[PDB]
């Protein structure tokens with residue numbers, strides 16, 4: 001799936017996200033909610049205002065989960081099982097929404113780290129997010 | 142993936158396709174070409190007229206491949222490897238098109254065998270076609 | 283894209299032969315048997331633990347009649363599908379919280395139910411006109427998710 | 429859906445700051461590096477065996493300028509996107525045989541290229557107006573696959 005070059009590319013770009021997991025996580029959810037407003041059907045309980053305490057707290061959680069997946073990039077199915085059952089069975093979130101978030105995550109990196117997210121690193125990070133998305137989708141069908 | 146009830150449901154509906162692999166295969170390609178005309182980009186060499194010799198010959202091939210997959214329903218990844226590399230690398234056919242064909246295959250069964258394709262059998266046959274589609278897609282990414 | 287006169291004649295002439303009460307109950311039962319998780323949106327209809335329950339549940343049967351009756355109003359508004367379904371889009375978003383990707387899946391089931399009930403009318407070209415209608419109704423139902 | 433005046437001001441004001449030659453070359457290079465198989469459609473441009481080749485290939489660079497220049501004509505025709513791109517839809521279908529699902533992927537890359545070049549303009553609300561534009565241009569380019 002991911003090559004050894006993809007894995008080192010992904011560990012490098014993600015080190016720039018270190019110290020900003022709440023800030024970057026919060027912006028990626030705000031971008032998904034605005035650019036793909038259909039995604040708000042899953043969050044009927046949230047205040048959807050900018051830098052809402054609930055959006056900050058969820059953004060920190062999603063980015064922390066991605067941080068753990070970068071650390072366990074060799075075995076994503078084993079690192080993300082608990083989230084896989086939550087997403088694919090308890091929330092039954094449709095696979096297309098994962099694509100919408102992975103795109104908002106790539107825009108946040110591009111905004112904060114334009115030069116770091118070179119075409120080769122973009123290629124590797126897209127590949128990693130697709131893989132993470134597939135473990136959270138593997139039992140939805 | 143597929144249950145033992147799904148497998149026996151799938152072997153039962155497919156026995157009605159026996160003797161009509163060219164006829165049913167040809168109609169399912171004609172339905173895909175008409176209802177999803179974007180799919181004609183993959184067949185620039187074909188005569189697209191009704192009961193065209195080239196459509197008859199391709200329809201027989203696709204349905205024969207599905208016949209072999211029903212016989213080897215326990216190990217679809219091993220039964221369909223040769224087709225998996227052809228579709229996912231040589232033709233690079235996008236995953237959404239497989240959904241369009243699986244739907245045209247379900248319409249052909251519904252037209253010729255309305256009573257046989259009961260809600261439970263429909264459920265099993267949809268599941269089998271999704272699984273076949275995923276083996277032909279597994280290396281496209 | 284607007285329906286040509288050929289598309290319009292396929293749709294209008296087949297819909298006059300449809301038993302909307304029967305085909306709607308058939309399509310909703312099939313949606314809940316082919317996608318068993320979607321029962322989550324209909325738990326207030328009661329017993330749905332397996333396919334026999336679903337096929338004998340009367341709240342499922344009646345809901346299916348109304349859904350297909352609503353879809354059948356598209357046949358009278360072929361030049362205004364987006365505008366006719368705007369209120370019903372907003373209700374699926376704000377009240378029922380239904381992911382708009384699911385409208386295509388029910389549309390595909392409706393095509394199968396129609397094929398089975400009208401095998402001689404549902405020609406390659408009739409099928410293509412109906413797939414264009416289900417695509418437009420699905421898009422119109424997804425259009426007020428703001 | 430038509431662009432409101434807020435959407436129209438985001439799009440029109442940011443596109444006046446875009447270096448179309450640079451951003452287009454960037455987006456096509458990224459499309460061929462992120463999806464290496466799509467080089468199949470561009471083999472006549474010559475050397476593309478790896479990312480360094482792609483970034484120094486001048487036929488890739490010039491093709492990128494023209495593609496983004498074409499996308500930039502949508503900003504002058506926001507009320508007529510479908511009608512402006514009809515000829516170019518038909519050419520992608522009949523001549524280049526390109527699967528219409530790929531128009532969304534290039535549109536998503538254009539958003540990333542714009543975000544990187546204009547970090548302070550590309551606000552949450554500016555991004556939402558641009559995602560609506562890329563969705564409509566992709567749909568318009570897919571519309572004459574008959």
Ligand code: HEM
Pocket residue numbers: 039042043058061062063065066083086087091093097098099101132133136
């Ligand atoms: C990168 C992809 C994703 C990751 C890593 C991720 C991660 C998480 C995590 C860590 C949680 C919290 C689990 C917990 O608190 O125990 C969660 C909850 C949730 N996620 Fe995701 N998620 C992803 C994609 C999505 C998408 C695309 C959607 C919907 C559009 C979604 C909707 C939800 C919802 C609704 C919850 C429950 C929210 C709540 O009330 O707190 N997730 N996810």
Ligand code: HEM
Pocket residue numbers: 180183184199202203204206207224227228232234238239240242273274277
């Ligand atoms: C159930 C799904 C499918 C099966 C079982 C299937 C099976 C086959 C088989 C058996 C062949 C011939 C391989 C050979 O001759 O050695 C083939 C070729 C081909 N398939 Fe498929 N296929 C499927 C889906 C699709 C879809 C969705 C598309 C495109 C929309 C597609 C496009 C093609 C094309 C372009 C060829 C080469 C055609 C030629 O020139 O003969 N296939 N496939």
Ligand code: HEM
Pocket residue numbers: 320323324348349350352353370374378380384385388389419423
């Ligand atoms: C062809 C597509 C669809 C049409 C035309 C349609 C039409 C309708 C109509 C007419 C109502 C009744 C509104 C009212 O009188 O209050 C309704 C309710 C509802 N629909 Fe749909 N619908 C469609 C697809 C779906 C799908 C795909 C789902 C979920 C998977 C869904 C879930 C619901 C739910 C949960 C309700 C409320 C049921 C109740 O509490 O009585 N709909 N729809």
Ligand code: HEM
Pocket residue numbers: 466469470494495496498499516520524526530531534535565569
């Ligand atoms: C934003 C979306 C797109 C726009 C606006 C666009 C625009 C253009 C334009 C303006 C041309 C030149 C036409 C001419 O003057 O003859 C062209 C050619 C072409 N496009 Fe696109 N295009 C887009 C997406 C794509 C995608 C996604 C692919 C394939 C992955 C693609 C493949 C091609 C090919 C193969 C050619 C012919 C190149 C040549 O032989 O010179 N296009 N496109």
